[PDB]
Curated annotation (Swiss-Prot):
Belongs to the splicing factor SR family. Interacts with NCOA6 and JUN. Interacts with ESR1 and ESR2, in the presence of estradiol (E2). Interacts with RSRC1 (via Arg/Ser-rich domain). Interacts with SF3B1. Interacts with ZNF106 (via N-terminus). Transmembrane segments: none annotated. Widely expressed. Highly expressed in pancreas, skeletal muscle, lung and brain. Expressed at intermediate level in kidney, liver and heart. Aryl sulfonamide anticancer drugs, such as indisulam (E7070) or E7820, promote ubiquitination and subsequent degradation by the DCX(DCAF15) complex. RBM39 degradation results in splicing defects and death in cancer cell lines. Aryl sulfonamide anticancer drugs change the substrate specificity of DCAF15 by acting as a molecular glue that promotes binding between DCAF15 and weak affinity interactor RBM39. Antibodies against RBM39 are present in sera from a patient with hepatocellular carcinoma who developed several autoantibodies. The lineage of its organism: Eukaryota, Metazoa, Chordata, Craniata, Vertebrata. RNA-binding protein that acts as a pre-mRNA splicing factor. Acts by promoting exon inclusion via regulation of exon cassette splicing. Also acts as a transcriptional coactivator for steroid nuclear receptors ESR1/ER-alpha and ESR2/ER-beta, and JUN/AP-1, independently of the pre-mRNA splicing factor activity. The modification Phosphothreonine is found at T4. It is found in: Nucleus speckle. Residues 11-87 form the RRM domain. Coiled coil: none annotated. This is RNA-binding protein 39.
Length: 87
């Protein structure tokens, strides 16, 4: 049941340029179209004056990572998201 940290990294994307008001629910919903989401972790202490929030989104399968990266530029709460491999 336990994945190693490296195995979890292989399933995780790092997200940038998140709207100040973003919620984990918003990321769960957005990424659900490319795979099953296991965990969402907001890293940013919200700067309300900037659309530069960050988060990790961990999927169940490694297959979802390239698909999620491909969503880069799509508008989440009106702001183009940047999605990169965690590792």
């Amino acid at each position: 049941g336990n994945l190693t940290p490296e195995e979890r990294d292989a399933r995780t994307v790092f997200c940038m340029q998140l709207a100040a008001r973003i919620r984990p629910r918003d990321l769960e919903e957005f990424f659900s179209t490319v795979g099953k989401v296991r965990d969402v972790r907001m890293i940013s202490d919200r700067n309300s004056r900037r659309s530069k929030g960050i988060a990790y989104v961990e999927f169940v399968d490694v297959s979802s990572v390239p698909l999620a990266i491909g969503l880069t530029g799509q508008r989440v709460l009106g702001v183009p998201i940047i999605v990169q491999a965690s590792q």
